[PDB]
A paper describes a structure:
Superposition of the VαVβ domains of free 12-6 onto those of 12-6 in complex with p53R175H–HLA-A2 revealed structural differences in the CDR3 loops. Whereas conformational adjustments in CDR3β were restricted mainly to shifts in side-chain orientation, CDR3α underwent a large movement (r.m.s.d. in α-carbon positions of 3.7 Å for residues 93–97), which allowed CDR3α Gly94 to hydrogen bond with P4 Glu and Arg65H, CDR3α Tyr95 to hydrogen bond with CDR3β Leu97 and contact the HLA-A2 α1 helix, and CDR3α Gln96 to hydrogen bond with Arg65H. CDR3α Tyr95 showed the largest individual displacement (6.5 Å in its α-carbon position).
Several TCRs have been isolated from TILs of epithelial cancer patients that recognize a neoepitope corresponding to residues 168–176 of p53R175H. This neoepitope includes the arginine-to-histidine mutation at position 175 (HMTEVVRHC). The TCRs are restricted by the common MHC class I allele HLA-A*02:01.
Residue numbers in the entry:
A (entry chain B): 3 to 39, 42 to 244
B (entry chain A): 2 to 125, 130 to 146, 148 to 178, 181 to 200
Amino acid sequence: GVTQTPKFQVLKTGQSMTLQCAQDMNHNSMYWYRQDPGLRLIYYSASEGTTDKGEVPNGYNVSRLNKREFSLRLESAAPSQTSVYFCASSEGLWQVGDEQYFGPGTRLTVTEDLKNVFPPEVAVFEPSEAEISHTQKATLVCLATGFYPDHVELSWWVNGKEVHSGVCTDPQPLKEQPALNDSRYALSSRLRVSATFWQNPRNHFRCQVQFYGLSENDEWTQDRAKPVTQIVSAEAWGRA
Amino acid sequence: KEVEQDPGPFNVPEGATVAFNCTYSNSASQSFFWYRQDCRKEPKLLMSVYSSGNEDGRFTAQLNRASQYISLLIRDSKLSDSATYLCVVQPGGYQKVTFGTGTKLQVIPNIQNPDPAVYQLRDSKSVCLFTDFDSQTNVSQKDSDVYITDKCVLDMRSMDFKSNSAVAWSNKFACANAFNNSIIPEDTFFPS
């Protein structure tokens, strides 16, 4: 329906960037919103040839290129523009009952220094023997720790297949230092299986954290590894 | 900023009925919508709202133009209904559409056989797992070197079994003391 690129982005203060948005629904009207911990209209485009400021236009620019595409531009990013950005479209904002379809959104983080970006450390913690004895069930825990920005996706893979049954992931990464603006984050998930499942040594449990970070384009001078968009996994094996 | 909705968040037992209400100031308002938004995701149309009343399955919506409110009724709540529900108003004339701040819904399952326990798990150093506690136990946030997660529901579908858990960990520390700021039921299992 409504596509947005990129889905994730970390910028240095003062850098520029454009968020791209496309609808294949032949709508006239398109919008750009930001959402902060609701929705505020940045700018809108009522039809192909025109654009107009929304509630919070300061710091942004937009092109209505063609009927199909509506770009949002951040001239020079400021920390305050850290936010979730949603593109939307509608058949025509002048009609009674006009319905808006949202794009998936773009989580954008602005920091003073790209040295604050870190991929997650990932570890799998094995079921307690006491849990296994008491319940005849076994709960694994995956921890992703030390990452920034909080742009991660966690999934569980058992024997080469992605699983949802028995899985709980925290809705939200928590801040390791809630006071700090550059706090690094942590995310936990559980995966619970039967005792006999865990006790099969052939069973393979893999926690997979997708991290989104710096692009290839971004410049790195720090002694440590360039914190790029990457996947990190941690693994466990069954034990009788 | 002139649509006002339920503050929230709202806890509703699984299967029970949930009710949402929203007021709007502009009585010349033309169109009305309920949107639903999952955590870390985008808003989605749930339904249009008419004076007629409106029913799709478990969802009923009502507009009352005389009194300036809209409503949403959800029967037979599912765990999958957990989300934020945004009131949405299209004024139609000189103003932009307004989206409400939203009311957060958390549909809570019944745990028939609480088995509250705190287990310690080792790295394939260690974390603490509080689990199998009933849905009305509350897990609290106090130590800055102790990390405590909110309550999370997992669903072992093949066994038709739900259970709550919370994870805690620290660099400083024993599981016995990890969840003290929560009212932990006495007889919570603490393994040898």
